[PDB]
């Protein structure tokens with residue numbers, strides 16, 4: 071199977087005057103490239119998928135593909151939707167516009183059954199010929215892709231090569247790789263990047279890497295080389311920022327941190343997302359002081 | 367405040383050859399009207415909001431407004447979205463096309479903060495001049511509209527007159543009506559319709575009423591007339607069907623029941639929703655046999 075692994079970043083989507091700051095977007099991805107990141111994920115949850123139009127969603131995928139051309143960095147395009155027809159459309163767009171693969175979040179709100187999830191991802195996988203990474207985050211979607219369903223999709227579909235797990239369930243992470251060791255388990259929860267990697271996970275799709283790409287990059291590559299003492303040291307070191315970046319709902323804290331670091335021009339969200347509390351703003355600002363934040 | 371209360375139905379959306387069966391849709395609404403229902407809710411969760419296009423979502427609102435014209439039955443149009451700009455657009459469409467009010471689900475997937483929920487609903491309420499009913503269903507959205515936020519929105523926004531609660535939290539329903547007794551608490555949980563009404567709730571937005579509109583209507587009207595013994599009697603009798611209609615994720619069981627009752631033409635969903643397992647199909651069919659289903 072073709073895979074996309076290593077250190078990956080769930081890209082924030084900067085706004086300027088209520089519109090996607092496409093030049094800031096390209097600059098941020100380009101900063102990621104220059105700091106050891108292996109792949110970028112445009113328009114995930116962290117990229118405010120929900121509030122982008124289908125045209126802006128597609129524009130962000132294009133900017134990512136263009137910016138990464140001529141580099142080793144891959145584009146794992148965010149292509150999820152709770153409507154199968156729409157997820158297939160995003161998958162086909164990403165394939166036709168040069169993405170190396172797609173991430174596809176489990177359908178949110180409408181809570182499909184395991185059978186429905188299987189048919190949902192199989193239709194997505196059959197629509198294109200690029201790798202497809204499942205994305206399980208039950209706290210946001212209201213549904214869970216079971217281990218059995220994940221393993222079935224991995225074995226039944228050629229392009230489905232693994233899962234990004236944001237479920238706080240290291241037991242499930244053991245379950246997955248003990249019964250199907252060929253799949254690529256990707257950490258979608260920064261605080262436990264090292265435990266997932268140390269159990270045979272092969273990469274991360276990180277929120278923290280938006281702010282500290284070099285540290286997340288080093289952590290992942292240390293761990294992939296089985297340098298667990300160095301990988302764990304970084305993971306323990308990052309715990310404080312990893313947790314404070316979810317003081318409020320992601321991506322509210324990470325965008326707050328990027329703004330405080332001078333990496334984006336304005337602390338702008340699209341409703342229903344909003345600025346952090348004044349208190350959490352100060353808490354984010356205080357935790358950042360213990361870290362070396364790279365500029366451009 | 368301007369209000370829409372009483373017995374209300376979260377309308378299923380019948381599909382025929384992958385398209386909205388518009389003549390069946392109108393026929394089902396007239397069946398609701400003829401069985402004592404006070405209002406209909408087009409395109410909720412039960413109406414497969416997630417997988418309808420904007421054109422379809424809008425068409426279903428039109429059919430409901432249009433079919434209920436000349437009757438006492440009101441149209442509480444489903445207008446929720448996890449993107450505030452889209453929720454404002456749906457609200458404005460419903461107002462301009464003759465809906466009596468709108469239902470608006472709390473944003474799903476992107477998990478706004480309480481401040482974000484307030485600004486989300488404030489923007490919706492200011493966009494129209496018709497009543498707005500909040501909709502809290504944390505098991506599907508991943509977020510909760512707190513009691514304080516609901517009460518603030520009720521007091522600060524003219525159009526916001528209550529909430530449809532689908533949270534299995536009768537404590538919160540006491541909390542809401544003890545601190546703000548003027549709001550219209552609406553049950554969004556069929557199994558506990560009577561307990562919510564007996565504590566001062568003023569209506570239901572029912573899934574079960576799709577199949578048994580006469581029974582849900584009678585339950586609500588018994589309770590509103592303070593005949594709690596008869597309202598509880600129907601609630602107790604309906605428990606078995608109320609539960610089996612969620613053996614799988616709504617609206618998979620209710621559409622199965624409507625199809626088994628001969629009320630719709632095909633057991634058709636849009637992916638990622640799918641037909642139930644063969645057990646739950648058989649379980650739904652067996653529970654239905656103990657209830658008298660009205661025809662057309």
Ligand SMILES: N[C@@H](CCCC[NH3+])C(=O)O
Pocket residue numbers: 119120121122123124127151152447448449475
């Ligand atoms: N707000 C909708 C539409 C998003 C379209 C662009 N990703 C959703 O989250 O599914």
Ligand SMILES: N[C@@H](CCCC[NH3+])C(=O)O
Pocket residue numbers: 151152153179415416417418419420423447448
């Ligand atoms: N699937 C998207 C778009 C649906 C728009 C029509 N109701 C959502 O659930 O938000």
Ligand SMILES: [Mg+2]
Pocket residue numbers: 123125126129
């Ligand atoms: Mg555009």
Ligand SMILES: [Mg+2]
Pocket residue numbers: 113114115148149150151173174175205
């Ligand atoms: Mg996705």
Ligand SMILES: [Mg+2]
Pocket residue numbers: 150151152153156
């Ligand atoms: Mg979508």
Ligand SMILES: [Mg+2]
Pocket residue numbers: 154155158193637
């Ligand atoms: Mg399809």
Ligand SMILES: [Mg+2]
Pocket residue numbers: 295
């Ligand atoms: Mg090495």
Ligand SMILES: [Mg+2]
Pocket residue numbers: 329330331332
């Ligand atoms: Mg600054």
Ligand SMILES: [Mg+2]
Pocket residue numbers: 372402403404438
């Ligand atoms: Mg009436």
Ligand SMILES: [Mg+2]
Pocket residue numbers: 409410411444445446447469470471501
């Ligand atoms: Mg709604």
Ligand SMILES: [Mg+2]
Pocket residue numbers: 568
């Ligand atoms: Mg009253």
Ligand SMILES: [Mg+2]
Pocket residue numbers: 642643644645
């Ligand atoms: Mg079966």
Ligand SMILES: [Mg+2]
Pocket residue numbers: 643644645646
């Ligand atoms: Mg079964």
